[PDB]
UniProtKB/Swiss-Prot annotation:
The C-type lectin domains, also called carbohydrate-recognition domains or CRDs, 1-3 have at most very weak affinity for carbohydrates. C-type lectin domain 4 shows the highest affinity binding and has multispecificity for a variety of monosaccharides. At least 3 C-type lectin domains (4, 5, and 7) are required for high affinity binding and endocytosis of multivalent glycoconjugates. This is Macrophage mannose receptor 1. It comes from Homo sapiens. It is found in: Endosome membrane; Cell membrane. The gene is MRC1. It comes from the Eukaryota. Residues 1-121 form the Ricin B-type lectin domain.
Amino acid sequence: TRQFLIYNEDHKRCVDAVSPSAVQTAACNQDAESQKFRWVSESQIMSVAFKLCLGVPSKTDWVAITLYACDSKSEFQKWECKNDTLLGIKGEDLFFNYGNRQEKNIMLYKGSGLWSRWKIYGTTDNLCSRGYEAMYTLLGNANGATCAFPFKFENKWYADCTSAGRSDGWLWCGTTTDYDTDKLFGYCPLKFEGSESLWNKDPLTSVSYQINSKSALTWHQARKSCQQQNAELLSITEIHEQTYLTGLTSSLTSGLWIGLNSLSFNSGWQWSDRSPFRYLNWLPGSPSAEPGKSCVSLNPGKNAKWENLECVQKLGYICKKGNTHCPSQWWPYAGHCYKIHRDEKKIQRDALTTCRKEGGDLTSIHTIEELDFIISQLGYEPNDELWIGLNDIKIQMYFEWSDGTPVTFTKWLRGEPSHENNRQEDCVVMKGKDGYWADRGCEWPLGYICKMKS
């Protein structure tokens, strides 16, 4: 999945490593470790056989590309893909090239020709396709630091995650390159027997959860460490979910990252996996109005309630592997009919009824296309404040639609949802050039939109 064979279409022969002194080409053989290569940084390319990166003595022409000890900053081991199948050194237009058979060796040339076009064996998406992605460790003493390749364990070099020196066959990696000295390690987000014992799956939902309490990453590092596990940062969508994870995080104390954030500039709080932000559970004082704050943490030491901590703080994190014809005045969309009212302005409750006396209900919105229809086609204007069907009248911090349709979709105005800990009941308005939503006390009289079926 991450190792590959470097290969030249025209010569139909792959790149091979015979020695640190010499890098040649041979007949392609994917069972020959000599030939196998693998990214290690954004730029470096290492041989899994010898655990050394391909590099040059200088950025000059016709010098031999050979294997050097791999070095984050030696700026001769750095490579990049140009034009397409081109492979050259960064900064200077000099390219990986097939070796003139005088010096049996890959060399660096200035020709953008057919001898300088390389490509992963058995594919057509250039070698910056299988590019390096930093893989954050699980558990371990290194607090989830990224894997370091290569690393030395018991005086041998390992090019990927290994189950060496272990009875259990788990896959681990050093987080520095000399693990034998620093002894910092963790487990790789890959699949092996024991892999799944790092998740919980609530017996009811079947959604799974990973609690990384011993790690300490920024919000964005955390988010990337669940995407590479085909997951995402934790979303809390139902009252059952918050209680279930309050049980898991009962015995923990330091804050943990969840997917709730205000990182988009014309949009309020939102879940990182695009789950609808319908259920709230803030700590007193949050959402804090401090302008620099956009990422939410879950505090297991304060009954699993939520607070926003700078997205550069290094905390733990939780991941989540889920899974026609209408009355006059009224206008249709998606089989329903809509209307905005300002003849008389009414309280939320009295607005709800004049949409049932009219034969419908305060409007529900389940898709962004639906929200788009409301603002374009019903004479709505950007400086409006219109009641809609969202509310938490039965249960605070739990928004449902008045018409009893499921809340499949959220789109908050920036700054919103407002002050819920400052009131007892939370109704929802539509306002702003984009028609985004805001929550407020219900017992405020405003205009409204309603929705009916045909």
